[PDB]
Amino acid sequence: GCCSHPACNVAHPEIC
Amino acid sequence: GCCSHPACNVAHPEIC
Amino acid sequence: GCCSHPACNVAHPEIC
Amino acid sequence: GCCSHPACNVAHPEIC
Amino acid sequence: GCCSHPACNVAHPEIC
Amino acid sequence: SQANLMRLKSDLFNRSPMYPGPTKDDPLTVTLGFTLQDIVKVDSSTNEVDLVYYEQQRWKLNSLMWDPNEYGNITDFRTSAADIWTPDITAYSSTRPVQVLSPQIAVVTHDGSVMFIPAQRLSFMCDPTGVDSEEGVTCAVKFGSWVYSGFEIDLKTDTDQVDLSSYYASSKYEILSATQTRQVQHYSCCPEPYIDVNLVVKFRERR
Amino acid sequence: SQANLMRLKSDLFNRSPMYPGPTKDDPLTVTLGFTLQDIVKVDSSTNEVDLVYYEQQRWKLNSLMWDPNEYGNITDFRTSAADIWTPDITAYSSTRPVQVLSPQIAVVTHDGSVMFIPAQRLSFMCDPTGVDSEEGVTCAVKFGSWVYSGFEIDLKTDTDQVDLSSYYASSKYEILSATQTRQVQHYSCCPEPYIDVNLVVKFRERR
Amino acid sequence: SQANLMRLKSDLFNRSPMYPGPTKDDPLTVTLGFTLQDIVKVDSSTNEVDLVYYEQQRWKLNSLMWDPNEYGNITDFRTSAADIWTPDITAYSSTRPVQVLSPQIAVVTHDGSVMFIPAQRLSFMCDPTGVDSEEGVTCAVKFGSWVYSGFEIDLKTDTDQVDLSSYYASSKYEILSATQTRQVQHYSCCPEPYIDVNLVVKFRERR
Amino acid sequence: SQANLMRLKSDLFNRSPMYPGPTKDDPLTVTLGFTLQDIVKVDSSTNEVDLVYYEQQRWKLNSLMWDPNEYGNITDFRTSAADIWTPDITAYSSTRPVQVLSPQIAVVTHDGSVMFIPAQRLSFMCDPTGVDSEEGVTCAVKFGSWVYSGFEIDLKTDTDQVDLSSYYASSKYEILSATQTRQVQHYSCCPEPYIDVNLVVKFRERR
Amino acid sequence: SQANLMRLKSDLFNRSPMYPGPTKDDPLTVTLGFTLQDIVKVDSSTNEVDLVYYEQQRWKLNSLMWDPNEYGNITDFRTSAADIWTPDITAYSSTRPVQVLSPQIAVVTHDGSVMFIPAQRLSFMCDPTGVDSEEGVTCAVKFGSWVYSGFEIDLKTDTDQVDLSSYYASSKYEILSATQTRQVQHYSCCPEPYIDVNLVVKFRERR
């Protein structure tokens, strides 16, 4: 559920 | 007349 | 129409 | 009665 | 207490 | 290749003065045009109407010219409108400062012409009584230079009719007519002409 | 050409530091004059009313002058108001900060005189109770300098009738009277005068 | 060491001026993904609705690549979006200037990627009469770049479904559909395409 | 003449690093006084009340002194408030950012004292229940420095009476009292005092 | 002697390029704290609640370390928060850009720790149905960094009891519980922890 988070998203391009 | 028009006023100090 | 699209408008002064 | 008016309020610290 | 006055909060990290 | 643009922008905006405006001896033609998107709000109680539109402006300056093969065959570029002089065409009957709704980027082409179409929201004087009918209401806004007469800025327009091809087909109003007409007036005292563009729209509520 | 204009603007502003305002050694005369376009809104619940007007302002500095025969026969030019000293005339009973509705551009003519007419919207304190009738209400706003006394900035008006030749026809109020009268004033303590132009408007709803 | 990061940042932004923007002999493509968070308010008397959302933007520049084994083995870093060029992706049917409700900090990785999730509140044009039902309303906003034809900036949506795994639980509107479709159109006059992501939201009053 | 004013303004501001704020070793006294003009709004649905007032501040910096005959017998001058340090005197119980209603200009005099009285509009916390009774209500708002204790910035009043000699006649609220009271607090933890001026006004609805 | 501070200040701000944020080779613990002041507005139309509060921030950088015996035995100073790096801690469900109600000035002390407590007005998402009940209603808003994860910014509270000692006595609302809860959370894909303070308020209309 990481792409719902502004800071997990911006650090993980491959998932999000 | 002229004094109610902004460009005409700043251009005519003698009238306005 | 093209000229209601802001990016086409700027690129085509002959049309818009 | 000056201090009610800004230009004199700053002109006259002794009074205001 | 002192940690709700803003100028006391910043001056006392050991408390606030 | 890509460095030529970076050099060109530096040649025109750092190593050259900014244009000081037109003079009587070197006047300037400015082209105005409107694209209406929505009549957003209509205040029965203060006589303000709110429009959302694109506002096209175009002018052409010799100081902005360049020869494309001295700059890698570049014919035009996009730059922020802050980097350049712009005309003072303003609404003579606004009641609030206009709000910008888009970037303000202009396209400069090598012959010296500039195109610029920001998205704006205007609030101006207009009595709307009679809009709940089928006769509707006019408002007018005159647009002209704030400081230059017609001997220094010639306000033209390519068309008398404001592009509605992108008006909001599901608005609380739609448009019965929409005109942008150049007008010249003189004054008894004075030789120089004064141009505005009268923007006029009749519209009624959706019945 | 416009190259001459660019050089004149450079000589005035670039190597000469800006006017630090008037002193009483070297005082200044500043003429005011309003051009009222609309009374946009009254709030019977807060006792404020909103005017859209034009503030014309004139003054003259020996530092903004030049000899035209040395700058290509240039009588005058137009420049951003930010490039010059502008006086601090202020509404003393404003309620919300004043909103600018026009560009702020001034005309400097070669004898050092300056004119400058921004469009503004002003909210000030006024009892509208009694704007449901005919004899109507009147209320007033004093404009004047914020840090300068009559020994520094001498305020003044040419006419004392507000220009109404462009008031909005379909405005929800309409004016009966509208005057801009200079007022001098002293304080028990203090020798220097204290000037203000008093703007007063009798108005009422349309019929 | 904390200082390799500093030197790397210094060598990139006190390197040369910014990327002058995409051209055609150097185009670039941009991905968007909205994650929607709240339909906060509707307005039936103006046909405006406000939503708050994350807007995801990603692109790639060669002006920004670096070799990690030169900078203390640094893969990526965070910087203020003011330090780099950003694309002009804007809503075409907005009603008011967009408000940003978060910082604007990008993550730039060593091969040159930028990722960027600002939180925004936006008001756009929408006919809500019909949300007190079980079907609700669709509303549409097209997002595209403001001066770059689909030639120079190719848009692109990773998934076609906006993220709602963070939408407000107790919002007064539940959301039914919410698509992110990529639309291309040409014009009778002209060769190049014009791209835009059309976000369409189906929603109803919560019952 | 203006020569000397220009050279003195250029003999205090460039050639001197701007002042870094007061410290425990070099403390600073700030005399503060209020001049109240309206109670524009009241809001019993949220208990904001809006005031319009003049906030007079005065302090004394030695980095601002000069010898009057070393500069043409110049006793004092006016300057934009951005050119000088100003104290962080602020309202402890505001509910909106303060709006500034006037210019922000200060007078600096040859001994080195600034005086600076800007006009503001403040939304702060107050329960108005009782405005219409014949007792009115009593609101208070505290004013102090935000980062400086009584050991760096001492607060002072030249009177406990708020200058009402300019309260708007036709206001919708009559003022019964208007107090401005220096108050010194200590805390269990800490030796240094914390100062503020309590601005409490009792007021009534117009009858 | 006041030059000792004027001098020390320049020695960390002008001299060295500022701190590019927490790496993960050099992480950073940031401590958060709230002084809740007033629940100002509640909106059932739209599910938005407005708080006014003080946000306490604290962190420690080696970059701002210094020893007092080189700088006049001085141990701490105040500067504009613009002069230093600041954490990007953000409300995750805000519906407006927050507004600042105070100066933004930080106190950095010689071990390189800085404290920073600005006053703010926040609008965020909450269903307030039942604030007339004495179960009241309950809102929560979560605060965390926007671009930094658990390995770059660790987020602490000195306590989970929100300070109410300055909560407005005569508010339109009672506070029944007000806590600030540190919460950590891991994801499916990912090693990083993502931390946030949960600010949870039970409140009701005043009995």
Closest by CA to I185, choosing from I140, I161, I146, I150, is I150
Sign of CA dihedral I56, I62, I66, I68: positive
Q: Give phi and psi for A7, each to the nearest 5.
A: -100, -25
With 0-12 CB in 10 A as exposed, 13-18 as middle and 19+ as buried, what is J1? exposed
Question: What does the alpha-carbon distance between residue F81 and residue H88 come to, in Å, rounded to a whole number?
Answer: 13
Question: What does the alpha-carbon distance between residue F64 and residue F106 come to, in Å, rounded to a whole number?
Answer: 13
Classify strands H28-29 and J89-91 as parallel, antiparallel or unpaired. Answer: unpaired
- CB contact at 8 A, F70 and G73: no
Which residue in the block uniquely carries the two structure tokens 């045009």? F33
- Partner-chain contact B8 F190, CB within 8 Å: yes
Touching status, chains D and J (3+ beta-carbon pairs under 8 Å)? no
Q: What is the dihedral of CA H66, H69, H70, H74, to 10 degrees?
A: 70
DSSP class of residue G47 equals T
- How many CB atoms are located within 10 Å of the residue G178 CB? 19
What is the 3-state secondary structure of F141-160? EEEEECCCCCCCEEEECCCC
Question: What does the alpha-carbon distance between residue G33 and residue G50 come to, in Å, rounded to a whole number?
Answer: 18
Judging contacts by C-beta atoms under 8 Å, the chain J residues touching residue I22 are none
DSSP class of residue H69 equals G
Question: What does the alpha-carbon distance between residue H40 and residue H49 come to, in Å, rounded to a whole number?
Answer: 8
Rounded to the nearest angstrom, the minimum Cα separation between J87 and chain E is 16
- Give bridge partners of residue G33 from the DSSP assignment: G56
- Partner-chain contact F115 C10, CB within 8 Å: yes
Return the residue of H nearest to A11 by Cα. Answer: H107
Q: E strands of chain H, at which residues?
A: 28-29, 31-43, 48-60, 76-80, 89-91, 99-100, 105-109, 113-116, 119-125, 137-145, 153-154, 173-187, 190-205
Question: What does the alpha-carbon distance between residue J48 and residue J127 come to, in Å, rounded to a whole number?
Answer: 7
Q: What tokens appear for H41 in the block? A: 């308010």
Q: Give phi and psi for H132, each to the nearest 5.
A: -80, 25
What is the C-alpha end-to-end distance of chain H, expressed in Å? 56
- Partner-chain contact B11 G116, CB within 8 Å: no
Which residue in the block uniquely carries the two structure tokens 């404020």? G48
Structure solved via:
X-ray
- CB contact at 8 A, H168 and H38: yes
- How many CB atoms are located within 10 Å of the residue G39 CB? 26
Residue among J54, J115, J166 whose CB faces E13 most closely: J115
- Give bridge partners of residue H171 from the DSSP assignment: none
Query: Residue J49 belongs to what H/E stretch?
Result: strand J48-65
- Give bridge partners of residue G201 from the DSSP assignment: G139, G178
Return the residue of C nearest to H142 by Cα. Answer: C5
Judging contacts by C-beta atoms under 8 Å, the chain G residues touching residue B13 are 58, 109, 113, 115
Closest by CA to G152, choosing from G192, G118, G123, G114, is G192
Question: What does the alpha-carbon distance between residue I4 and residue I12 come to, in Å, rounded to a whole number?
Answer: 13
G21 Rama sector, left if φ>0, alpha if ψ -120 to 50, beta otherwise? left
J72 Rama sector, left if φ>0, alpha if ψ -120 to 50, beta otherwise? left
**CA–CA distances in Å: residue H173 to residues H95, H202, J45:** 20, 10, 11
Judging contacts by C-beta atoms under 8 Å, the chain A residues touching residue J146 are 6-7
Amino acid identity at F136: G
Question: What does the alpha-carbon distance between residue C5 and residue H145 come to, in Å, rounded to a whole number?
Answer: 10
Task: Indicate which of C3, C8, C12, C15 best probes the interface with F, i.e. most F CBs within 10 Å of its own CB.
Answer: C3
Neighbours of chain C (3+ CB pairs under 8 A): F, H
- CB contact at 8 A, H168 and J46: no
Resolution (A): 2.8
Check CB contact of I115 with chain D, cutoff 8 Å: yes
Touching status, chains D and F (3+ beta-carbon pairs under 8 Å)? no
Q: What tokens appear for I86 in the block? A: 């100003």
Touching status, chains B and I (3+ beta-carbon pairs under 8 Å)? no
What is the 3-state secondary structure of chain I? CHHHHHHHHCCCCCCCCCCCCCCCCCCEEEEEEEEEEEEEEEECCCCEEEEEEEEEEEEECHHHCCCHHHHCCCCEEEEEHHHCCCCCCEECCECCCCEECCCCEEEEECCCEEEECCEEEEEEECCCCCCCCCCCEEEEEEEECCCCCCCCEEEECCCCECECCCCCCCCCEEEEEEEEEEEEEEECCEEEEEEEEEEEEEEEECC
Question: What does the alpha-carbon distance between residue A16 and residue A1 come to, in Å, rounded to a whole number?
Answer: 10
Which residue in the block uniquely carries the two structure tokens 């003079």? F23
What is the C-alpha end-to-end distance of chain I, expressed in Å? 56
Chain A residues with CB under 8 Å of a chain H CB are 1, 3-6, 9-11, 13, 16
CB pairs under 8 A between A and J: 32
HSE-CB at J197 with a 13 A cutoff on CA atoms is 28
Closest by CA to F23, choosing from G40, J36, I53, G1, is G1
Check CB contact of I29 with chain G, cutoff 8 Å: no
Question: What does the alpha-carbon distance between residue H38 and residue J95 come to, in Å, rounded to a whole number?
Answer: 9
Closest by CA to F167, choosing from H148, H125, H45, is H125
- Partner-chain contact G168 F47, CB within 8 Å: yes
Residue ranges of the binding site of G: 76, 149, 152, 165, 186, 192
**CA–CA distances in Å: residue I48 to residues G62, I129, J186:** 50, 12, 42
- Partner-chain contact H78 J26, CB within 8 Å: no
CB pairs under 8 A between G and I: 68
Q: What tokens appear for J82 in the block? A: 């613009």
Classify strands J153-157 and J28-43 as parallel, antiparallel or unpaired. Answer: parallel
Helices of type H across chain J: 2-13
Check CB contact of I41 with chain G, cutoff 8 Å: yes
Question: What does the alpha-carbon distance between residue F126 and residue J49 come to, in Å, rounded to a whole number?
Answer: 36
CA angle G193, G195, G199 (to 5 degrees): 160
DSSP letters for G14-35: TSSPPP----SSS-EEEEEEEE
Question: What does the alpha-carbon distance between residue F191 and residue H141 come to, in Å, rounded to a whole number?
Answer: 50
Cα G61 to its chain centre, rounded Å, is 17
Helix (H, G, I), strand (E, B) or coil at H68: helix
Return the residue of F nearest to H93 by Cα. Answer: F37
Question: What does the alpha-carbon distance between residue I125 and residue J168 come to, in Å, rounded to a whole number?
Answer: 8
Question: What does the alpha-carbon distance between residue B7 and residue G181 come to, in Å, rounded to a whole number?
Answer: 25
- How many CB atoms are located within 10 Å of the residue J47 CB? 23
Question: What does the alpha-carbon distance between residue G175 and residue J133 come to, in Å, rounded to a whole number?
Answer: 52
Which residue in the block uniquely carries the two structure tokens 């507004």? J99
- Give bridge partners of residue H195 from the DSSP assignment: H184
Query: Residue D12 belongs to what H/E stretch?
Result: none
Closest by CA to H89, choosing from H111, H49, H59, is H59
Q: Give phi and psi for B6, each to the nearest 5.
A: -55, -45
Question: What does the alpha-carbon distance between residue I164 and residue G32 come to, in Å, rounded to a whole number?
Answer: 29
**CA–CA distances in Å: residue J59 to residues H77, H102, J22, J114:** 20, 20, 11, 6
Rounded to the nearest angstrom, the minimum Cα separation between I192 and chain D is 29
Query: Residue A5 belongs to what H/E stretch?
Result: none
Does I205 count as an annotated binding residue? Answer: no
- Give bridge partners of residue H199 from the DSSP assignment: H141, H180
CA angle G64, G66, G71 (to 5 degrees): 125
Classify strands F48-60 and F28-43 as parallel, antiparallel or unpaired. Answer: antiparallel
**CA–CA distances in Å: residue J117 to residues F140, H25, J97, J206:** 51, 50, 18, 29
DSSP letters for H162-201: -B-TTS-TT-SEEEEEEEEEEEEEEETTEEEEEEEEEEEE
- Partner-chain contact H187 C2, CB within 8 Å: yes
Question: What does the alpha-carbon distance between residue J51 and residue J41 come to, in Å, rounded to a whole number?
Answer: 8
- Partner-chain contact J105 I23, CB within 8 Å: no
- CB contact at 8 A, G152 and G88: no
What is the 3-state secondary structure of G58-120? EEEEEEEECCHHHCCCCCEEEEEHHHCCCCCEEECCEEEEEEECCCCEEEEECEEEEEECCEE
Query: Residue H5 belongs to what H/E stretch?
Result: helix H2-13
HSE-CB at F84 with a 13 A cutoff on CA atoms is 25
- CB contact at 8 A, H56 and H115: yes
Check CB contact of I191 with chain E, cutoff 8 Å: no
* Edge-to-edge strands, sheet with G137-145: G89-91, G137-145, G196-205, G173-183
DSSP class of residue F189 equals T
Residue among C7, C10, C15 whose CB faces H189 most closely: C15
Question: What does the alpha-carbon distance between residue C2 and residue G55 come to, in Å, rounded to a whole number?
Answer: 42
DSSP letters for G138-152: EEEEEEEESS--TTT
Sign of CA dihedral I14, I19, I25, I31: positive
- How many CB atoms are located within 10 Å of the residue J87 CB? 20
Question: What does the alpha-carbon distance between residue H85 and residue F80 come to, in Å, rounded to a whole number?
Answer: 12
Question: What does the alpha-carbon distance between residue F163 and residue F37 come to, in Å, rounded to a whole number?
Answer: 9
- Partner-chain contact H115 A13, CB within 8 Å: yes
Helix (H, G, I), strand (E, B) or coil at J119: strand
Question: What does the alpha-carbon distance between residue C2 and residue G83 come to, in Å, rounded to a whole number?
Answer: 40
Does I135 count as an annotated binding residue? Answer: no
Question: Could you tell me how many residues make up chain C?
Answer: 16
Does I149 count as an annotated binding residue? Answer: yes
Sign of CA dihedral F59, F63, F64, F66: positive
- How many CB atoms are located within 10 Å of the residue J15 CB? 7
Map out the domains of chain J as residue ranges: 1-207
Q: What tokens appear for G73 in the block? A: 């026969």
Classify strands G105-109 and G111-116 as parallel, antiparallel or unpaired. Answer: antiparallel
Closest by CA to G198, choosing from G134, G155, G169, is G155
I112 Rama sector, left if φ>0, alpha if ψ -120 to 50, beta otherwise? left
